Design a protein around this ligand. Sequence first.
Ligand SMILES: O=C(NO)c1ccc(-c2cccc3ccccc23)cc1
Ligand SMILES: [Cl-]
Ligand code: NA
Ligand code: NA
Ligand code: NA
Ligand code: NA
Ligand code: NA
Ligand code: NA
Ligand code: NA
Length: 214
Amino acid sequence: WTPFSWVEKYAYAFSGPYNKAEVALTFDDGPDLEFTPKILDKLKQHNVKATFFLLGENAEKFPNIVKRIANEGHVIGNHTYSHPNLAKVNEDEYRNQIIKTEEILNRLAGYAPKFIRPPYGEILENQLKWATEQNFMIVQWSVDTVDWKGVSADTITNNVLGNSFPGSVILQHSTPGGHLQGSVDALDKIIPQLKTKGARFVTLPSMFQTSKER
Ligand SMILES: O=C(NO)c1ccc(-c2cccc3ccccc23)cc1
Ligand SMILES: [Cl-]
Ligand code: NA
Ligand code: NA
Ligand code: NA
Ligand code: NA
Ligand code: NA
Ligand code: NA
Ligand code: NA
């Protein structure tokens, strides 16, 4: 496990360029029926695009919310199919979780997503090597809202505003059935205060200057 050396050897990163006044909001585990629509609305009221890492099994249940994300200018990412610990699977099951989710998202969004985020941040070097050759790009995160703990919006705001820098990639969740109401309300405080500091919200394709599709 050498996360640092991998950013020089593969398509793999934790944050973006230091010389741009840009940050990136990302959302995991969706789509869902309660939190994804709210996030989309608050992102609409703040003129902000984001990047959604969607589970393949959840895109099947709510195929229109996948389409709503892409139609509103957001970028869709691959978050595997059934959310397993990729460090505990073999190559064929790893490549099965990726390619299966890709075909589901390609059918709904109209493109094969280029960005992969491994659940729990767990991934192995050979898995990373395979995705690099397949023209993927894995992006983790550098600011953790730890919103799955069900924390409040004020707590998430101080946690985000206290650890955000140019190039920060922020992690939030739109998990079906999670305690994420404070994570949604935090967007009303996080987005304006970072704008006060001069930050612009971009998607992962714009931050790393690459296409959204593979
Ligand atoms: O994308 C996720 N789920 O879909 C996800 C789940 C949990 C965490 C997560 C939360 C808190 C601390 C962590 C420390 C190391 C690795 C992951 C951590 C980050 C992301
Ligand atoms: Cl490209
Ligand atoms: Na790592
Ligand atoms: Na980094
Ligand atoms: Na950075
Ligand atoms: Na409903
Ligand atoms: Na192959
Ligand atoms: Na920086
Ligand atoms: Na950062």
